[PDB]
Amino acid sequence: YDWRDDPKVNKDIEEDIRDRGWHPETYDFPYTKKHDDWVFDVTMPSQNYQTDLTVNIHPENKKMHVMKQVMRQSYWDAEHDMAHEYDYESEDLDFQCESFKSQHFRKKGPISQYLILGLLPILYFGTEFFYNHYPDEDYWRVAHPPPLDYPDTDDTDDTETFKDYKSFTGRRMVDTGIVDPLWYDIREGKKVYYDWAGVNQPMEDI
Amino acid sequence: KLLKQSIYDQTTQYKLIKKNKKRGELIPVTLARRILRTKKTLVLPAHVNIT
Amino acid sequence: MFFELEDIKRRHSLYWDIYNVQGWVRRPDSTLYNNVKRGVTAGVVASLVQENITALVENCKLLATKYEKPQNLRQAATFMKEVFKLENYRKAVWNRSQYALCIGTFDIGARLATFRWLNNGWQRVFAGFEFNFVRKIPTTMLAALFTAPFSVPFELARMAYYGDKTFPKELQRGYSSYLSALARIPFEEGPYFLFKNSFPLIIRNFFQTFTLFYTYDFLKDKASFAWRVGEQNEYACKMIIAGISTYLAAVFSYPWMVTREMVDFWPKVPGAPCTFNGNYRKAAVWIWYHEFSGNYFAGFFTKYFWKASPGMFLTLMLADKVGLFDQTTVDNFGGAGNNSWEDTFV
Numbered sequence A: 001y002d003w004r005d006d007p008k009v010n011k012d013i014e015e016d017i018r019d020r021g022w023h024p025e026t027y028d029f030p031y032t033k034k035h036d037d038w039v040f041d042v043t044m045p046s047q048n049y050q051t052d053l054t055v056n057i058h059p060e061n062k063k064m065h066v067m068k069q070v071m072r073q074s075y076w077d078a079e080h081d082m083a084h085e086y087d088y089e090s091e092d093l094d095f096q097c098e099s100f101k102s103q104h105f106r107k108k109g110p111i112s113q114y115l116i117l118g119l120l121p122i123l124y125f126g127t128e129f130f131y132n133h134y135p136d137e138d139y140w141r142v143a144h145p146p147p148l149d150y151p152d153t154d155d156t157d158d159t160e161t162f163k164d165y166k167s168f169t170g171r172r173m174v175d176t177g178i179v180d181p182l183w184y185d186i187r188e189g190k191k192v193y194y195d196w197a198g199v200n201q202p203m204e205d206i
Numbered sequence B: 001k002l003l004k005q006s007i008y009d010q011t012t013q014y015k016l017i018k019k020n021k022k023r024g025e026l027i028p029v030t031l032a033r034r035i036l037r038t039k040k041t042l043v044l045p046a047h048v049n050i051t
Numbered sequence C: 001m002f003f004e005l006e007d008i009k010r011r012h013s014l015y016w017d018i019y020n021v022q023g024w025v026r027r028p029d030s031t032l033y034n035n036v037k038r039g040v041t042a043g044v045v046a047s048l049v050q051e052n053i054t055a056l057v058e059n060c061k062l063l064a065t066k067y068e069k070p071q072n073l074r075q076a077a078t079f080m081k082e083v084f085k086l087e088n089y090r091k092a093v094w095n096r097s098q099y100a101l102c103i104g105t106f107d108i109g110a111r112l113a114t115f116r117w118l119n120n121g122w123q124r125v126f127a128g129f130e131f132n133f134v135r136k137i138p139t140t141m142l143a144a145l146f147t148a149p150f151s152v153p154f155e156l157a158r159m160a161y162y163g164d165k166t167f168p169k170e171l172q173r174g175y176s177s178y179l180s181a182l183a184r185i186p187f188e189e190g191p192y193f194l195f196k197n198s199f200p201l202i203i204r205n206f207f208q209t210f211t212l213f214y215t216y217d218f219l220k221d222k223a224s225f226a227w228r229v230g231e232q233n234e235y236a237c238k239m240i241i242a243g244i245s246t247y248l249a250a251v252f253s254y255p256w257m258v259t260r261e262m263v264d265f266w267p268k269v270p271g272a273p274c275t276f277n278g279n280y281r282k283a284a285v286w287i288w289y290h291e292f293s294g295n296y297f298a299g300f301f302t303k304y305f306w307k308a309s310p311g312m313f314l315t316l317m318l319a320d321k322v323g324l325f326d327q328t329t330v331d332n333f334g335g336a337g338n339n340s341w342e343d344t345f346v
């Protein structure tokens, strides 16, 4: 006996209200305990008042009783279950004994792995995309426009586009309205997008 | 429907429409043919069978 | 260098993608001052109306408990006039207006500011519907958890102020007003008097704010096809979406608030231990695992719905009007949309 394992004596053990009246350690495997039977005096009187004219039953005046929690599933005993399942190799006859207690019963165990089970879609998708960097390392990164005339003019074409917009043809096209207004300004060696362009500023070249 | 001399810059217009053309939420396929452009369209007559 | 942990700063090289949009870009309007101002304004405006409605309904119930309820339109009109001129009604309106000023400025304003801070930059798809709302889910959850406990101190101060008025003169503190009670409680009972056993209020606030803000933001964009293709009334659609959002918030929030009744108000069996040991968290867990929903959904409207839902609905409408749910949308084939213009028309 050890008081450290006794909830009554050890106040550090947090009682689970949802498991009141259920002791998994006391299960039989097979379970052969009766815990439910006829219950009266709660709403239906146990005595007889069918013909009592001076007594009228009022079910609304139900007295509150002890909460009956749903039965808790059995919890495994590691050592006992391992010993029960253990069989000696070349010392035991291959047979099934008459006793039904030899049946291998399933008992719920640790619940920590089920957290990972529940989070598996998040973990699996993170491994698939973020961990493996699929399809590439830039798709999931915060988008940044290229710097001014970077990497090459043939790709960026910021200066030529700026000159075209500032030219007569660019102004005429903007007046037509088919072409939207310019979205960046070429500052003193740097390209700055307008706040209405809805894009981040280009990353620094370092 | 007249072929007039262009006072603008055709290359500049082409580049501008390539880069920053104006689109809309409800734009018809006729005005949005991004992936439906070819050359030498096949011309057939109407109201007659062809094998 | 400064302490045991070192915040190592590292430099990186240039990187860019074909598309510069539909990701995360902080809006210029998303700032501490502007977001806080808009959130406080919307929260105060909503809370004033919510508390005025609550006071009016409670005074109507108080008058009806002593006088017969209206039988026709004329009787209803005179009943409402009498409620308006009731002495208790005016004091209740004043105190609850102060309470609304305190709440909408420190709780609803904080919720709106945090939501804007954490979700302003989620751009939407041009000529389409925003996908990948799973990306926004963490932001809304973070904001809800951060701003959940900002109302429990004010709510406990209100409860203490109202419960002090009903004690004898000897045992009555004598609070001049709700503001005076709030200013005095921290120095009399201590700061923890305004936070002890705050799990019900905290979980209620979380399940309200998260499922209101996120659901409204999701719906206002996903159901937009109604007025974008069906040519329906955008304002009517937004009103319906806000109503759905507030109803869902009330449904998801009331069960956790029911824990107060179960633990303290339900009669205790003589000689037996408390069914929940006085733990609101355990009571909430029991509610979560309970088979029958109606048992803890009883009293949903007479107790919580008309005290919480109208305020949330008004808050959603005001936030939408001011622009706390407005996102930035730009064409992905435009000048700033993408860095590859050679295949936007070819």
Ligand SMILES: CCCCCCCCCCCCCCCCCC(=O)OC[C@H](COP(=O)([O-])OCC(O)COP(=O)([O-])OC[C@@H](COC(=O)CCCCCCCCCCCCCCCCC)OC(=O)CCCCCCCCCCCCCCCCC)OC(=O)CCCCCCCCCCCCCCCCC
Pocket: A078, A109, A110, A111, A112, A113, A115, A116
């Ligand atoms: C304040 C803010 C919050 C802070 C959070 C801090 C913690 C992190 C967050 C955790 C989640 C919190 C939210 C609640 C979730 C609900 C469950 C819960 O937490 O309930 C409380 C939980 C109750 O646990 P339970 O499982 O219900 O019952 C335990 C009883 O002892 C059962 O007694 P018994 O006698 O019946 O059985 C004995 C033994 C029986 O043991 C066996 O059966 C042995 C199994 C074969 C041997 C290999 C075991 C070790 C490898 C792990 C399993 C791999 C296979 C499964 C694949 C998925 C693994 C995740 O029990 C076990 O099964 C123990 C092993 C369980 C493994 C399952 C995974 C545990 C980790 C969960 C995620 C958190 C860590 C993430 C990083 C590491 C991931 C691995 O108690 C805890 O607080 C435990 C937390 C998890 C374990 C600690 C992990 C630390 C890792 C650090 C690095 C490695 C150091 C050690 C290695 C050696 C040195 C290098």
Ligand SMILES: CCCCCCCCCCCCCCCCCC(=O)OC[C@H](COP(=O)([O-])OCC(O)COP(=O)([O-])OC[C@@H](COC(=O)CCCCCCCCCCCCCCCCC)OC(=O)CCCCCCCCCCCCCCCCC)OC(=O)CCCCCCCCCCCCCCCCC
Pocket: C141, C142, C143, C145, C146, C147, C148, C149, C152, C191, C192, C195, C196, C197, C198, C199, C200, C202, C203, C206, C279, C280, C281, C282
């Ligand atoms: C931003 C993060 C975003 C993350 C997003 C994540 C999204 C995905 C996951 C979402 C779900 C997450 C669930 C987490 C685990 C929940 C476990 C649970 O339910 O049981 C816990 C706990 C159960 O405890 P219990 O033993 O069963 O007692 C039951 C009692 O009825 C209630 O317990 P009690 O009455 O014994 O104590 C109530 C608590 C009341 O405390 C509070 O209200 C503080 C907020 C956190 C309380 C959380 C409980 C305590 C946890 C340990 C200590 C936390 C320290 C503060 C937070 C940082 C560290 C986490 O009292 C204290 O702990 C000490 C109060 C001291 C007096 C007040 C002084 C305040 C500071 C004033 C000066 C500094 C500020 C102003 C000046 C600044 C400089 C100028 O339940 C709660 O307290 C509420 C849980 C609600 C769960 C629903 C979701 C909302 C969660 C909100 C928590 C965080 C609020 C914001 C602060 C942190 C971010 C800044």
Ligand SMILES: CCCCCCCCCCCCCCCCCC(=O)OC[C@H](COP(=O)([O-])OCC(O)COP(=O)([O-])OC[C@@H](COC(=O)CCCCCCCCCCCCCCCCC)OC(=O)CCCCCCCCCCCCCCCCC)OC(=O)CCCCCCCCCCCCCCCCC
Pocket: C291, C292, C293, C294, C295
């Ligand atoms: C589409 C069908 C096609 C095939 C047709 C086949 C032939 C006809 C159908 C078969 C008969 C079904 C009879 C159902 C009504 C039963 C009586 C009644 O009024 O219900 C109260 C009754 C509880 O009353 P009680 O037992 O006195 O409560 C005492 C205790 O609290 C014990 O309560 P507890 O522990 O059971 O917990 C109850 C709690 C926990 O249970 C729940 O929360 C149920 C969650 C159900 C989710 C799935 C339904 C759809 C959710 C909305 C999705 C948006 C689009 C919806 C419309 C398009 C899709 C259908 O729920 C509540 O708090 C009340 C539930 C709401 C009742 C709704 C009243 C109208 C019922 C008549 C039909 C309405 C049809 C319109 C659509 C459904 C409107 C709700 O609820 C039930 O017994 C559960 C079923 C409730 C209705 C849902 C099932 C029918 C619809 C099936 C849809 C299948 C597609 C799902 C995917 C949709 C994806 C968009």
Ligand SMILES: CCCCCCCCCCCCCCCCCC(=O)OC[C@H](COP(=O)([O-])OCC(O)COP(=O)([O-])OC[C@@H](COC(=O)CCCCCCCCCCCCCCCCC)OC(=O)CCCCCCCCCCCCCCCCC)OC(=O)CCCCCCCCCCCCCCCCC
Pocket: C243, C244, C246, C247, C248, C251, C294, C297, C298, C299, C300, C301, C302, C303, C309, C310, C313
């Ligand atoms: C896409 C197609 C979709 C098709 C399906 C959906 C369409 C409907 C299908 C058919 C079912 C509905 C029709 C039959 C039932 C109708 C309702 C009914 O008879 O019960 C009345 C009942 C009122 O209480 P009561 O039963 O008369 O008891 C009075 C007692 O004296 C005192 O009450 P208490 O405090 O003791 O509490 C009693 C309470 C006990 O507490 C509860 O049981 C509450 C929880 C109920 C179950 C909740 C989950 C299931 C429903 C949601 C999921 C399925 C629908 C999804 C809809 C998607 C969007 C279309 O009793 C109930 O409410 C239970 C029965 C009625 C509700 C549940 C069964 C009907 C289904 C829900 C109908 C309402 C849907 C609203 C919108 C939902 C949006 C997601 O419920 C309502 O009146 C609620 C609905 C109306 C809310 C209006 C205001 C909402 C917005 C807030 C406004 C704030 C002020 C500002 C206004 C500004 C204006 C400009």
Ligand SMILES: CCCCCCCCCCCCCCCCCC(=O)OC[C@H](COP(=O)([O-])OCC[N+](C)(C)C)OC(=O)CCCCCCCCCCCCCCCCC
Pocket: A116, A119, A122, A123, A126, A127, A130, A131, A132, A133
């Ligand atoms: C939901 C998260 C918790 C899950 C707990 C249960 C599962 C066990 C933990 C799985 C990993 C959790 C994510 C963080 C660590 C990722 C490490 C990794 O390989 O990623 C590199 C990868 C990419 O690394 P890489 O590409 O540079 O290289 C990886 C290695 N090679 C070279 C082989 C490819 O990065 C990511 O995928 C980004 C992950 C971001 C996660 C942000 C949220 C979590 C951060 C806070 C955690 C706080 C609690 C501590 C962690 C949980 C408890 C222990």
Ligand SMILES: COC1=C(OC)C(=O)C(C/C=C(\C)CC/C=C(\C)CC/C=C(\C)CC/C=C(\C)CC/C=C(\C)CC/C=C(\C)CC/C=C(\C)CCC=C(C)C)=C(C)C1=O
Pocket: C207, C210, C211, C212, C214, C215, C219, C222, C223, C244, C248, C251, C252, C255, C288, C293
């Ligand atoms: C509505 O979305 C959700 C949240 O807010 C965003 C949540 O916070 C949460 C988290 C909340 C929890 C875990 C607590 C839940 C409540 C508990 C435990 C207390 C008990 C509650 C009950 C018994 C009631 C159960 C009710 C339900 C199952 C029904 C819930 C209804 C949901 C999810 C939505 C129903 C459908 C709609 C509103 C349709 C909306 C769609 C349109 C208008 C058209 C959109 C069109 C397109 C094309 C997308 C969830 C699960 C959620 O689904």
Ligand SMILES: CCCCCCCCCCCCCCCCCC(=O)OC[C@H](COP(=O)(O)OCCN)OC(=O)CCCCCCCCCCCCCCCCC
Pocket: A121, A122, A123, A124, A125, A126, A127, A129, A130, A131, A139, A140, A141, A142, A143, C019, C021, C022, C023, C024, C132, C134, C135, C136, C138
């Ligand atoms: C059913 C489940 C899957 C659901 C669909 C998910 C699709 C995307 C893949 C995500 C998988 C994990 C779940 C994360 C959901 C929330 C974050 C998210 O969705 O990230 C998207 C967003 C970046 O995307 P965005 O840049 O907007 O994309 C378009 C850009 N032009 O990023 C953000 O908003 C920033 C988020 C930062 C924190 C993310 C943490 C993720 C952790 C995942 C598990 C990692 C496990 C690693 C294991 C290592 C083992 C050694």
Ligand SMILES: CCCCCCCCCCCCCCCCCC(=O)OC[C@H](COP(=O)(O)OCCN)OC(=O)CCCCCCCCCCCCCCCCC
Pocket: C225, C226, C229, C230, C231, C232, C233, C236, C237, C240
């Ligand atoms: C979007 C498709 C993918 C999502 C899933 C679809 C499931 C379909 C199941 C069949 C029953 C639902 C009805 C069909 C879907 C909704 C209507 C739709 O697809 O939108 C198209 C339609 C207008 O299309 P059309 O007339 O061709 O426009 C040409 C403009 N020159 O639009 C309209 O006329 C608007 C009609 C909107 C009806 C929405 C009903 C479902 C949403 C939940 C209930 C909303 C209740 C509140 C509605 C308030 C309206 C003010």
